[PDB]
Amino acid sequence: LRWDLSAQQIEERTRELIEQTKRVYDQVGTQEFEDVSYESTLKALADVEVTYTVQRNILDFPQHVSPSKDIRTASTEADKKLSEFDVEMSMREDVYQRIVWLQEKVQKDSLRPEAARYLERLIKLGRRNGLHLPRETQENIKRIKKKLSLLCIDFNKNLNEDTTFLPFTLQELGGLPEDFLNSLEKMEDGKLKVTLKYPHYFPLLKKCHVPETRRKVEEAFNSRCKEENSAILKELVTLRAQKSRLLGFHTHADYVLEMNMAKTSQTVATFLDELAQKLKPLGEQERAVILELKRAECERRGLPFDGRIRAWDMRYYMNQVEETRYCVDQNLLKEYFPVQVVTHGLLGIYQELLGLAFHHEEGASAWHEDVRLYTARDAASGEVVGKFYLDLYPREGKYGHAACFGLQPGCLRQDGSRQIAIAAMVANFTKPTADAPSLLQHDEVETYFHEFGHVMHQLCSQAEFAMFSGTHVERDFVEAPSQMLENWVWEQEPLLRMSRHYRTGSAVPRELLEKLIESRQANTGLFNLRQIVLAKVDQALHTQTDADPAEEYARLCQEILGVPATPGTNMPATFGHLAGGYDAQYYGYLWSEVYSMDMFHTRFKQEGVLNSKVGMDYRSCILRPGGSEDASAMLRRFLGRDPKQDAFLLSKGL
Ligand SMILES: [Zn+2]
């Protein structure tokens, strides 16, 4: 890895990398049948993926962290050129022919398991790209893919470019903080301008006690680009269905799910239906609580009470439930979670769980002075497992959300020796200063624990092929290991290891810990039922022929969530995931979370949350394979059976 590359070197490095890499593909793509071999074909492609991946990451990473705008821009441009190149190589028919020939020449069961898996994946990826099909079919696929890309760009752009706003008086905005107010564009009419952007939308629906104001904003927000985007959505659905058939599948969902743990649309439907049925009674209880809060508040404020929970009441009363029903003094809690302490305790927990020791590399080279490099070594032999950087504080130009970026993949080099994985964890926790400690909210501690889990997956994986390194697993399983790990921030012992009053050094009071842990369940029934509605709409649009998005969403909202969609709106027309690469996979969020609880409850809760023996089995069964083993097989080995929804429901008190 190199971090001192200028904007010009990035530009130069990109052209060179592409030319050198393309060279290997050209060589593989022009081999005569007779010269096709495992070493000249499979190994050649596997080897170049290793050299290319390392270099590519060095070129596209700076855009997310470099303090230099010139470097960030060149990195972004390189990323685009490299991404185009990746697609270009994946569509190479000449190269695919040699891979198909190799598959023919390779004797049955002659290859090592991961090598066989790699070959099968290459064959599969080409077929999913339609390279084995007739020219007329491929031409149609190409034409449809082009239209789909443009439609998706417009769907998102329409939403992002929208500048709709609603004018409200200080009274109509009752409930909103002072800091919030004033920050609004005061109109020459006196009224304040409220936009539909998230920074304005969410706080308003959660804090504004004026019902008519919440109603107007909800209607507007869920009606953005209604006409144009509903039209684009209808075309996306039809075109995706046609492309999927041309590629050999009865529905787009089935095409998409072939590569996921869920495998088929049927499996997903049953999953969502059963989950909805099981959560129904919890939803009924939560709605009864919210309706009572609304009745009481309307009576208190002298407002009319319609006896029904409206879409614009949800976020408001769910927040009230959390504040008045669970009562967690977050301001007090924060004082026990200074970032330095959380970092130390968090690293300590992962060390013990995985049998590792982290070593700070003082003075190591980094893209920013606040960045810290650590070497993870085996706790008994001291042998290096991998390396990771921690870039935790905000700064101009830096990626705004917490994330794990794989930099160097753990895999085998051309000579057979293993190269260690190197990853970087990025977060944006306030940096501690002179007399201003950085106290973390519990959600930040949760995010921290979650993200570092991915770092450990990156480093502990021992795949031999780059394609299967680290977090390169099924999309509906990649989040499962980290969500399983989030459970630690809801357990007393682990929390105590990551906390300490920043000033007095006192431990978090057990009474406070109890309430905190209990607050985890707040509004969970309705939160999940809504996610199910979204997952079902996504599946319906990608399995149904002529289902109407708005109508399907409305029907599901009433039957599952118990809260009606506002007439005249069209939430699906604003549903960005439908045009952001999550098409047919939205259920993945619930899928990973549900099964992550089985992983946690079945093994860690029964054998010891801080037991290193269970931790080593987790490292061995779940992390070590990387993507060299199907998720279903890793889970079956870790759980001793196939996963179930039982643990998740039990955690909800069902
Ligand atoms: Zn994650």
UniProtKB/Swiss-Prot annotation:
Cofactor: Zn(2+)
Example of a GO cellular component annotation carried by this entry: cytosol
InterPro entries in the cross-refs: MetalloPept_cat_dom_sf (IPR024079), Neurolysin/TOP_dom2 (IPR024077), Neurolysin/TOP_N (IPR024080), Pept_M3A_M3B (IPR045090), Pept_M3A_M3B_dom (IPR001567)
Active-site residues, as the UniProt record annotates them: E451
Enzyme superclass (EC): hydrolase
Modified residues (Phosphoserine): S149
Gene3D superfamilies noted in UniProt: Collagenase (Catalytic Domain), Endopeptidase. Chain P, domain 1, Neurolysin, domain 3
Chief location category: cytoplasm
Residues recorded with modification Phosphotyrosine: Y255
Subcellular location per the Swiss-Prot or TrEMBL entry: Cytoplasm
Assigned EC number: 3.4.24.15
Top-level taxonomic group: Eukaryota
Catalytic activity: Preferential cleavage of bonds with hydrophobic residues at P1, P2 and P3' and a small residue at P1' in substrates of 5 to 15 residues
Biological processes per GO annotation: peptide metabolic process; protein polyubiquitination; proteolysis
The entry's keywords: Acetylation, Cytoplasm, Hydrolase, Metal-binding, Metalloprotease, Phosphoprotein, Protease, Zinc
Keyword flag Transcription: no
Cofactor details (free text): Binds 1 zinc ion per subunit.
Residues where N6-acetyllysine is found: K234, K515
GO molecular-function term, one example from the UniProt record: metal ion binding
Binding site for Zn(2+): H450, H454, H457
Family note: Belongs to the peptidase M3 family.
Role this protein plays: Involved in the metabolism of neuropeptides under 20 amino acid residues long. Involved in cytoplasmic peptide degradation. Able to degrade the amyloid-beta precursor protein and generate amyloidogenic fragments. Also acts as a regulator of cannabinoid signaling pathway by mediating degradation of hemopressin, an antagonist peptide of the cannabinoid receptor CNR1.
Assembly information from the UniProt record: Monomer.
Full protein name: Thimet oligopeptidase
Organism: Homo sapiens (Human)
